[PDB]
């Protein structure tokens, strides 16, 4: 009867909007359970690579499926009450471009409440298996360290930290529940990678993995909002040039593209950002995922909703010092 308990807290505004996803598919809102499942695949996938079948076998074996029962029980209860949304916040805090979509739902009255910074959630993990509970906790560790939850969580919302926990698994693996330095961050990623392989037994994959990714930070800032504001200024200019670029490419004068001198030269990769706390201070966190599957920069929706890609890093790194935390490339 293994058991792991956590209290996590929102660092940035959190928007749990799974309800809206049925009518509006753009409104994707990863839950804690869902994001843990996602991050398990990124960890385990680092070792299975090509063998996508074997990955799905273990994933179902841990988290359950339609024909299966989960070997772990995950319980998530919010400890805070949702608070009233102030629409003045977007102009005031300089977050109006990265969180444009939230601002629009706000005005349309589609959402009225959210979970502000300081919102707390209890996460409890239970399993009969030691192998399973270790993998579950590693997943959650990864979700807090590199991920986030909710609507627009790839763009700074739903960044989390662990305020308190009782975890024999993290104790066993020599991991922490907070980062006191960037070096602790660097070392933990190596540890999480190294351990995950052992628990499972033991050529670029076609899906996102931890192993083949880049993690970077910048800061510290005065406060969280200042960090978010930096992302917003950068993204505004990124989007400005993006609009001009694709007006040319798609609707301008027809030109023949030239083949890259390097294979997959114009195949840029997904980029997520959010806020990580290091030494009690807020840092901007960026993660870039490199895999085999091609992901279009072009989507049949408004360009403001287009994914942020890895060529966005210039608009951060040209303006302030960036530290590499993990180099999969």
Curated annotation (Swiss-Prot):
Coiled coil: none
Keyword Phosphoprotein set for record: no
Family: Belongs to the CRISPR system Cmr1 family.
Designated name of the protein: CRISPR system Cmr subunit Cmr1-1
GO MF assignments: RNA binding
Compartments it resides in: Cytoplasm
Pfam families linked: Cmr1_like_C, RAMPs
Main location: cytoplasm
Superkingdom in the source lineage: Archaea
Gene (UniProt): cmr1-1
Biological process annotations from GO: defense response to virus
GO cellular component, as recorded: cytoplasm
Functional note: CRISPR (clustered regularly interspaced short palindromic repeat), is an adaptive immune system that provides protection against mobile genetic elements (viruses, transposable elements and conjugative plasmids). CRISPR clusters contain sequences complementary to antecedent mobile elements and target invading nucleic acids. CRISPR clusters are transcribed and processed into CRISPR RNA (crRNA), formerly called psiRNA (prokaryotic silencing) in this organism.
The protein's assembly and partners: Part of the type III-B Cmr ribonucleoprotein (RNP) complex, an elongated RNP with Cmr2 and Cmr3 as the base, with Cmr4 and Cmr5 forming a helical core along the mature crRNA (39 or 45 nt in length), while the complex is capped by Cmr6 and Cmr1. The 5' end of the crRNA is bound to Cmr2 and Cmr3, while Cmr6 and a Cmr1 subunit (Cmr1-1 or Cmr1-2) cap the 3' end of the crRNA.
Keywords: Antiviral defense, Cytoplasm, RNA-binding
């Amino acid at each position: 009867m293994f058991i792991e308990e956590f209290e996590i807290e929102s660092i940035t505004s959190t928007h749990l909007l799974e309800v809206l996803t049925r009518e509006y598919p753009e409104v994707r809102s990863p839950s804690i359970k869902g994001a843990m499942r996602w991050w398990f695949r990124a960890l385990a996938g680092s070792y299975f690579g090509d063998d996508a079948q074997k990955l799905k076998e273990i994933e179902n074996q841990v988290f359950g499926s339609t024909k299966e029962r989960s070997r772990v029980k995950i319980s998530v209860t919010p400890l805070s009450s949702p608070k009233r949304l102030n629409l003045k916040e977007f102009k005031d805090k300089n977050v109006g471009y990265i969180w444009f979509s939230i601002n629009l739902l706000g005005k349309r009255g589609t959402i009225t409440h959210y979970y502000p910074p300081g919102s707390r959630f209890r996460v409890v993990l239970e399993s009969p298996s030691e192998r399973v509970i270790k993998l579950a906790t590693l997943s959650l560790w990864a979700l807090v360290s590199l991920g986030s939850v909710g609507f627009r969580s790839r763009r700074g919302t739903g960044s989390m930290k662990i305020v308190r926990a009782s975890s024999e698994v993290l104790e066993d693996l020599g991991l922490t529940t907070e980062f006191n330095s960037i070096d602790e961050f660097k070392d933990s990623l190596k540890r999480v990678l190294d351990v995950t392989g052992e628990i499972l037994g033991v050529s670029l994959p076609s899906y996102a993995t931890l192993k083949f990714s880049d993690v970077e930070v910048f800061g510290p800032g005065k406060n969280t909002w200042e960090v978010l504001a930096q992302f917003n200024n950068s993204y505004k200019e990124y989007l400005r040039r993006r609009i001009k670029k694709y007006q040319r490419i798609i609707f301008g004068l027809p030109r023949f593209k030239l083949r890259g001198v390097r294979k997959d030269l114009r195949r840029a990769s997904p980029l997520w950002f959010g806020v990580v706390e290091i030494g009690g201070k807020p840092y901007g966190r960026i993660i870039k995922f490199f895999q085999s599957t091609f992901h279009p920069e072009v989507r049949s929706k408004h360009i403001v909703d287009w994914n942020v890609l890895s060529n966005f890093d210039w608009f951060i790194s040209s303006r302030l010092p960036v530290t590499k935390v993990w180099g999969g490339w």
